Automatic annotation (TrEMBL), chains A, B:
First and last residue of the signal peptide: none
EC annotation from Swiss-Prot or TrEMBL: 3.5.1.1
This protein's encoding gene: ansA
Keywords (A to Z) from UniProt: Calcium, Cytoplasm, Hydrolase, Metal-binding
Cellular component aspect of the GO annotation: cytosol
Coiled coil among keywords: no
Designated name of the protein: L-asparaginase 1
One function term, GO molecular function aspect: metal ion binding
Location of the L-asparaginase N-terminal domain: 5-187
Sites where the protein binds substrate: 59, 90-91
GO biological process: aspartate family amino acid metabolic process
Length: 331, 331
């Protein structure tokens, strides 16, 4: 009972009720259910307080305004609690985790994002396991980062991506070990070091930004790429081949160079599931910068973070390449 | 010696020579090397003939014209040999395999695409293992499909994607079992059935097509998506969340609907590594069709295949959803 954890129920199946025509949201259901589940109220578990969002947020409909609402909620409650669990739908859980990691600078209490495939109230649901363990971990094994908890593993949030969804749900962090394994015996993986706090919590403002995220393929044309870079685009994430290669084709390279010449930030990520971009090539000559081993989620949210501040394109290009929150490995 | 296999050396590290400033292409080197490697000439191995492309093709510079050149080469040599091994750089190997699967209709001899991280001539290279086993498999364990051979596994070509590249190379087929395991003991996985031949080999013509491949993310705007769909775009592949969800946002949906209303084919794939799109939703209402569990490679090359023929947008939308060559699972 000693530790006290804030639970923000933003949306997601985890808190829903079953019906003849699908799982459905029901106000107050999550709290009503938990009151009747004594395992949540054992002496070994922290006290917790639930704030249900109204309306609930469908994670596929999430916008950066919703990222900001969650960051604000953590910030106004920061001193009152020892840690924070955010319940969230699975579809964009990894985007929210990544965004929060950039927004919550100098975070010094644990923030765990989680959810489930099956509502808490069903028999055998992952909802019950995920909430129970996020609460227990936040209180007893705090990791002072934005992390994501799923299938018994605690991932660094800005290293996660959704790995599967059809018939069952699963997350992965392809380029970094988990922070912690939550089986029968909880095991922190201490070779993954958390970002250090250089002062008081600073909560940044993020707004929607016009970013293109596109995939290179054989014969992709200048005209097509030209359209990707039209106003109002401020930045473009390229997903290229292998260690960051693209066609040596003037048509393509001229469009990217003209874009960078007018202030557009162009970031190279790999199409590969894991591994790093390693870039002099013609792409560098065209102003394109390396996204290293970032996930699409981390790159996309990091661009939102940097474009939302008062930074020149050159300042942005430099910071995109620096490890700000543990989201990238640079040699 | 009985079986006879054609080897098309299109490009790739596999046939290169090491130098002080990288691996480099050298005409005739692959043939010269193989002449000196008696394991390739044992009685248990097939005879083989090498056709080195001139110039070699850098796989990151590949275009659909190069897909066509390879398909043509197989077609002119089809009756002369019992099977075909295509040596290829790793960067876009999975695109070529997928494209060839659609182009080579009623294929009734094995076509194996392969390559390596290290040139054949080095000590301990995967180049030597990959060529040796592709030759042996094509002759002794023929699978009459376009397949891709790498890290001791034979994948269905149109189910493959490049899984890693930094520091080492690897391929995966996330939504289907391998066709065959090539360890010490070769094991065909007979629960994966090959497409049947409905007559003589038909080799289709493919030309470059203006296709957008883009990723959905929280708050993505109508203006940005509008630009993705401008002329000359004929088709768009969306990579959406989980089982195929996107923001319920009129701004986004109206742009997609207007595009479909003017003949643009819009295909939904998942951002997830594995699993299937399962779609009535507003995306369906907007004319978007399911790509099921297709890889980006299969969808992109299948669109090239269908756009390159005399088909209406409606005909294309129907065929994109049908399993033509083993590239998708529909329930």
């Amino acid at each position: 009972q000693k530790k006290s954890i804030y639970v923000a129920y933003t949306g997601g199946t985890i808190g829903m009720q079953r019906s003849d025509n699908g799982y459905i949201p029901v106000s107050g259901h999550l709290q009503r259910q938990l009151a009747l589940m004594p395992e949540f109220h054992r002496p070994e578990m922290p006290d917790f307080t639930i704030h249900e969002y109204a309306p609930l947020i469908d994670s596929s409909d999430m916008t950066p305004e919703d990222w900001q609402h969650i960051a604000n909620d953590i910030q106004q409650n920061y001193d009152l609690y020892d840690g924070f669990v955010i319940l969230h739908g699975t579809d964009t859980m990894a985007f929210t985790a990544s965004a929060l990691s950039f927004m919550l600078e100098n975070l010094a209490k644990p923030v765990i994002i989680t959810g489930s495939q099956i509502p808490l109230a069903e028999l055998r649901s992952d909802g019950q396991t995920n909430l129970l363990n996020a609460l227990y971990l936040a209180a007893n094994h705090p990791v002072n980062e934005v992390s994501l908890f799923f299938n018994n593993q605690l991932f660094r949030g800005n290293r996660t991506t959704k790995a599967h969804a059809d018939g069952f749900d699963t997350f992965a962090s392809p380029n970094l070990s988990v922070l912690l394994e939550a089986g029968i015996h909880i095991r922190r993986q201490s070779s993954v070091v958390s970002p250090t706090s250089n002062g008081p919590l600073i909560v940044h403002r993020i707004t929607p930004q016009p970013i293109g995220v596109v995939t290179i393929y054989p014969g992709i044309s200048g005209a097509v790429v030209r359209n990707f870079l039209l106003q109002p685009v401020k930045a473009l994430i390229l997903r290229s081949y292998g260690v960051g290669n693209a066609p040596q084709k003037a048509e393509l390279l001229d469009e990217l160079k003209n874009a960078s010449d007018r202030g557009i930030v162009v970031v190279n990520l790999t199409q590969c599931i894991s591994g790093s971009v390693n870039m002099g090539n013609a792409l560098a000559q065209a102003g394109v910068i390396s996204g290293f081993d970032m996930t699409v989620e981390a790159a996309l949210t990091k661009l939102h973070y940097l474009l939302s501040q008062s930074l020149s394109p050159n300042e942005i290009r430099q910071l995109m390449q620096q490890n700000l929150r543990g989201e990238l490995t640079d040699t």
